[PDB]
Amino acid sequence: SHGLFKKLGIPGPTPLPFLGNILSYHKGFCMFDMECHKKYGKVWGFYDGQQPVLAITDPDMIKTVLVKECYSVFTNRRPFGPVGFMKSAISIAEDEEWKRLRSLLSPTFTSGKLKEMVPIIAQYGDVLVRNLRREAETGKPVTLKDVFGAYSMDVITSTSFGVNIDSLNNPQDPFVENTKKLLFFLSITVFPFLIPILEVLNICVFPREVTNFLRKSVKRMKESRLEHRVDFLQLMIDSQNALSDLELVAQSIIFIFAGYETTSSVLSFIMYELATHPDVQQKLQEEIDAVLPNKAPPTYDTVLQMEYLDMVVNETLRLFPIAMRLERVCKKDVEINGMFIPKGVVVMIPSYALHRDPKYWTEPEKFLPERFSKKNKDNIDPYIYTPFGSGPRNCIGMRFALMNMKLALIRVLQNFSFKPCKETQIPLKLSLGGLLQPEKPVVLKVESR
Numbered sequence: 001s002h003g004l005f006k007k008l009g010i011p012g013p014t015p016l017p018f019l020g021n022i023l024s025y026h027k028g029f030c031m032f033d034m035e036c037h038k039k040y041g042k043v044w045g046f047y048d049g050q051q052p053v054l055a056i057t058d059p060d061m062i063k064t065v066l067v068k069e070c071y072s073v074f075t076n077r078r079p080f081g082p083v084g085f086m087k088s089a090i091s092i093a094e095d096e097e098w099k100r101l102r103s104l105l106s107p108t109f110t111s112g113k114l115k116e117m118v119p120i121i122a123q124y125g126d127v128l129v130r131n132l133r134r135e136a137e138t139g140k141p142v143t144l145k146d147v148f149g150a151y152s153m154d155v156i157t158s159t160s161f162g163v164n165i166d167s168l169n170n171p172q173d174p175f176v177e178n179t180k181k182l183l184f185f186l187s188i189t190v191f192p193f194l195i196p197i198l199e200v201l202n203i204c205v206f207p208r209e210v211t212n213f214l215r216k217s218v219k220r221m222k223e224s225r226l227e228h229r230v231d232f233l234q235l236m237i238d239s240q241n242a243l244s245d246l247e248l249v250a251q252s253i254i255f256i257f258a259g260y261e262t263t264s265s266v267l268s269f270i271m272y273e274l275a276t277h278p279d280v281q282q283k284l285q286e287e288i289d290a291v292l293p294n295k296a297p298p299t300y301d302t303v304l305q306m307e308y309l310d311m312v313v314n315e316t317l318r319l320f321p322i323a324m325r326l327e328r329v330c331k332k333d334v335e336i337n338g339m340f341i342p343k344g345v346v347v348m349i350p351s352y353a354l355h356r357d358p359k360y361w362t363e364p365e366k367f368l369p370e371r372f373s374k375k376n377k378d379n380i381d382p383y384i385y386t387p388f389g390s391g392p393r394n395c396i397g398m399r400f401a402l403m404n405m406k407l408a409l410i411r412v413l414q415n416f417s418f419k420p421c422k423e424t425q426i427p428l429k430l431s432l433g434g435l436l437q438p439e440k441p442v443v444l445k446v447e448s449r
């Protein structure tokens with residue numbers, strides 16, 4: 001196994017027996033990939049345990065793996081841990097099973113279902129500013145992930161399920177509290193031969209306590225709808241006239257998690273960039289005041305007209321690409337762009353590394369929204385810039401995410417400016433676990449306009 005890259009003539013860091021390159025992870029995924037990129041160039045190989053990984057950085061090659069040969073060769077992500085009934089979730093599902101779920105869930109986020117959600121998301125936006133207004137009344141430092149996550153949970157559960165769980169007004173919220181706790185891998189990558197063992201043992205990477213709750217909760221929601229609109233929950237209900245009850249719950253838990261956690265983390269990172277770059281925050285507030293005169297309620301069309309808001313969201317996602325790597329399993333021997341790729345190798349695209357690459361971005365360490373204007377919208381390669389992946393298995397929730405984040409942004413900036421305080425960690429630093437998160441929570445002061 002460990003001589004494979006040697007044999008192909010692919011450079012990379014020498015593997016230890018059994019562990020592979022796992023120890024290099026002490027400094028985090030991001031740095032490992034950044035160093036390997038500097039040291040080895042456009043292509044390199046390394047071993048997660050005994051699992052060979054081929055990192056690629058050449059735009060043409062990326063397109064081929066993410067786009068042209070998605071269905072034939074590069075359809076699936078790496079098999080994932082002991083997972084239970086969560087095996088059925090779209091992100092983990094494989095080949096035909098993946099295709100039919102993708103096709104079933106693809107309509108959840110069409111243009112028109114987005115537009116029809118703006119009314120709903122906007123009622124939560126007002127509750128969000130109402131919450132932040134009270135906290136601004138005291139001058140108390142705000143941990144934005146709490147306030148953003150409560151908002152994110154309300155939005156996803158009401159857009160997807162038709163239920164107002166009222167997370168914003170409820171400090172003890174079971175949904176938030178459970179959904180976060182659903183979060184070892186070191187031991188297993190050194191030993192993947194264990195995962196199939198842990199089916200028998202029916203243990204999981206999330207507590208039974210959390211999946212119990214969510215199963216119950218979504219079941220209640222289904223039955224509620226059975227005893228109106230067309231959402232994510234109807235789509236799955238309609239298919240059941242070929243989805244099973246467990247499959248339905250599986251997709252629910254993915255959407256619930258992603259709608260809650262990804263949106264809230266990115267929103268906190270944006271606010272951090274706006275707090276530390278007052279001029280960018282000022283200029284964003286001027287665009288929003290000019291598109292929405294006199295604090296006017298956001299609409300679908302008006303969100304599309306905010307060119308600077310889009311540049312700020314994109315630039316934050318360049319610096320903070322919460323996936324950090326994209327992956328696909330090579331499912332049969334193939335040669336693409338002059339290079340041979342054997343079957344069962346993981347092909348990996350190091351987005352975080354590429355987002356910071358001086359060949360592609362001038363001053364890539366700096367928050368510079370203007371790199372995303374129509375002036376430069378063309379100097380930016382879509383295979384280098386991948387905050388949401390690319391091709392047929394890109395992030396299905398991408399437009400939901402952008403719209404939801406933008407609406408939260410318009411509302412909050414229409415009412416407040418954000419500033420650092422004694423509690424903000426300046427130079428923000430990143431946690432060194434396998435999740436793109438701040439070392440400390442983003443805390444900022446909130447002031448009324």
Ligand code: HEM
Pocket residue numbers: 066090091092102254255258259260262263266321322323326327386387388389390391392393394395396397398400401402
């Ligand atoms: C800013 C927020 C988000 C970011 C940056 C993000 C990013 C990603 C990325 C990088 C991937 C891998 C795509 C690829 O491999 O090419 C992905 C996949 C996925 N995302 Fe997101 N995502 C976000 C929000 C969401 C939301 C809100 C949802 C659900 C409503 C969602 C649902 C999914 C699903 C179901 C997949 C797997 C799709 C499939 O396997 O067919 N994401 N996302």
Ligand SMILES: CC(C)c1nc(CN(C)C(=O)N[C@H](C(=O)N[C@@H](Cc2ccccc2)C[C@H](O)[C@@H](N)Cc2ccccc2)C(C)C)cs1
Pocket residue numbers: 077080091092182253254257258262322323324325395397434435436
């Ligand atoms: C950082 C990256 C290298 C990885 N993270 C993981 C584990 N996690 C935490 C994960 O969400 N995994 C995936 C999943 O289904 N990710 C969901 C949600 C979810 C997973 C497990 C349980 C509950 C919800 C996340 C979300 O759908 C995207 N919108 C966010 C995303 C995508 C790719 C990589 C990183 C983040 C799956 C690839 C195992 C494995 S590899």
